[PDB]
């Protein structure tokens, strides 16, 4: 049983329908570069939509983002024992939780489904249901790559750990010109090609 | 290259809290407030990992206390009702009688309270409807996903009705089988 560990939220420093609303958010962010090689821990605290205090492992101390976090940071940097856990979180929290989950998150591959249909001239290459989001779509008009007339909807998150995108081609098909759409994805061992067959 | 966030929030006076995990924009798991247990976004994830929810609920209690201190230190300054962006999508390209999913995507909003209702021909659909939790953004607003599995029809029209305090009326985004492309 692989186990996820938590980063403990720190206690702060003491100074129905049409009612005021008050929100406090805490985000413990782990940023990864080159796999588990370069790891940056980032303990960030928010009131409403605004950051007030933040721990950066590249800085090594709690610093105030606005004036409201100034009592907290001085309090939190007055306890060196707390700061040692916050600095060691890069190895004990970020890299651990990267480890328990690398199989089904980092190395997750889902096959894209590719469809070519004409719309309201205009051709659409709809690529749906893939993971990760690193996708590359090219339009080959008569065996020639079109760089003039390609508009993409961009990466669209579905929330099912699946992405989708609709790359469009604005051209003028007249008599039996063959059009080809190609998809490059890490879940594919070879590039995927679909022809419109005019 | 990769980003994993432990996302926590608490909202007063609704007294609503949330603890969840995020990998590169997608939810890994969400600790359910009631029933005191983890809910993996994909069921396979629970057969590959595990997490104790009770310490997460302790962190939510710490978030409640920190919200008390921040509310006193802000002279009771309220949150801004940032209105939401609603787009109705389809999981696959629609063909008639070929099963698909209608996705109501809600984006760029705070506070994280929204009333979402699916309407089939103007009638609410309260059963067989899925949803995600309030997923956090990097501008520290919120996004949410709602799913209605359906079977496309020539005559049926659907509506996503999203209610937020940043709006003066409920927002109604329309979808029919014809004119399914509004994405420029």
């Amino acid at each position, epitope marked *: 049983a692989p186990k996820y560990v938590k980063q403990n939220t720190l206690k702060l420093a003491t100074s129905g329908d049409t009612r005021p609303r008050f929100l406090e958010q805490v985000k413990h962010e782990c940023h990864f570069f080159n796999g588990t090689e370069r790891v940056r821990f980032l303990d960030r605290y928010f009131y409403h939509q605004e950051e007030y205090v933040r721990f950066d492992s590249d800085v090594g101390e709690y610093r105030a983002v*606005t004036e409201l976090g100034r009592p907290d940071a001085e309090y939190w940097n007055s306890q060196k024992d707390l700061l040692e856990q916050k600095r060691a979180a890069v190895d004990t929290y970020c890299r651990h939780n990267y480890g328990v989950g690398e199989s089904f998150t980092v190395q997750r591959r889902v096959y894209p489904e590719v469809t070519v249909y004409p719309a309201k001239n205009l051709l659409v290459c709809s690529v749906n249901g893939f993971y990760p989001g690193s996708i590359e779509v090219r339009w080959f008009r008569n065996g020639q790559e079109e760089k003039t007339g390609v508009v993409s909807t961009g990466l669209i998150q579905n929330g099912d750990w699946t992405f989708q995108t609709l790359v469009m081609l604005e051209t003028v098909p007249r008599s039996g010109e063959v059009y080809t759409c190609q998809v490059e994805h890490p879940s594919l061992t070879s590039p995927l090609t679909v022809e419109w067959r005019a | 290259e990769h980003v994993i966030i432990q996302a926590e929030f608490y909202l007063n006076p609704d007294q609503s809290g949330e603890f969840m995990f995020d990998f590169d924009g997608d939810e890994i798991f969400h600790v359910d407030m009631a029933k005191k247990e983890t809910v993996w976004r994909l069921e396979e994830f629970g057969r590959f990992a595990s997490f104790e929810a009770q310490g997460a609920l302790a962190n939510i209690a710490v978030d409640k206390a920190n919200l008390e201190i921040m509310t006193k230190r802000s002279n009771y300054t309220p*949150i801004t009702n940032v209105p939401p962006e609603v787009t109705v999508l389809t999981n696959s390209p629609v063909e008639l009688r070929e099963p698909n999913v209608l996705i109501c995507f809600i984006d760029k909003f705070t506070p994280p309270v929204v009333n979402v209702t699916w309407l089939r021909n103007g009638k609410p659909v309260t059963t067989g409807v899925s949803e995600t939790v309030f997923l956090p953004r990097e501008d520290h607003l919120f996004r949410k996903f709602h799913y209605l599995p359906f079977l496309p029809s020539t005559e049926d029209v659907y509506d996503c009705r999203v209610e937020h305090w940043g709006l003066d009326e409920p927002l109604l985004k329309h979808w029919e089988f014809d004119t399914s492309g509004e994405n420029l």
Partner: antibody
Amino acid sequence: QVQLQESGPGLVKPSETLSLTCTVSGFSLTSYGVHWIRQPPGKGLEWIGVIWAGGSINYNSALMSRVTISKDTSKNQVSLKLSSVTAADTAVYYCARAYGDYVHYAMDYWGQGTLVTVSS
Amino acid sequence: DIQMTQSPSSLSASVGDRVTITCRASQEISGYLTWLQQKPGKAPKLLIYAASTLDSGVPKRFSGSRSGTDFTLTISSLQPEDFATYYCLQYTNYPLTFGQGTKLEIKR
């Protein structure tokens, strides 16, 4: 490439009608509304009006009788007309973008602006 | 119809300084304030919306908050390219009204 680009005459005689067009790209005029804001040189900014994605049009009370804002979604353009222009209407005119059909949606991505000089 | 009072009218500060522009509202704007930056010969660029939400493409050194009933744009470490005119804008009710503007200049 989200772009908004103003276009128009530049020089209008007094008491005539100024006619400007904002041509947009990168987004849809059926999903986005656009604001018209004018800035006299040296002075501040002044909101002229909005045309939302649903076709709702809102003008300012000071220029209510003189401002007409319309929309051609097919050509991705929005037109602003000022009737009976005076020398106070000489300004740099801007079209900006907002989401949806409500005022509480923030104004994103302004355009570069065109200069209109009212002189005979 | 809603009044936005911007202060100070002009400002000069050194590189690396922390500057603070304040904007008073006559009524309550319910958090719907936008901070805009206009470099000369250019359009206003969206810096902050909803009084503290940072637009994508704005650097981290800009921050928005509320000092009591007044609103606050804060540049943490001032840079030479931040010479501009800054405007506050309410978007809670028609008509949308801007401030007079603050001309931020660089000392050297």
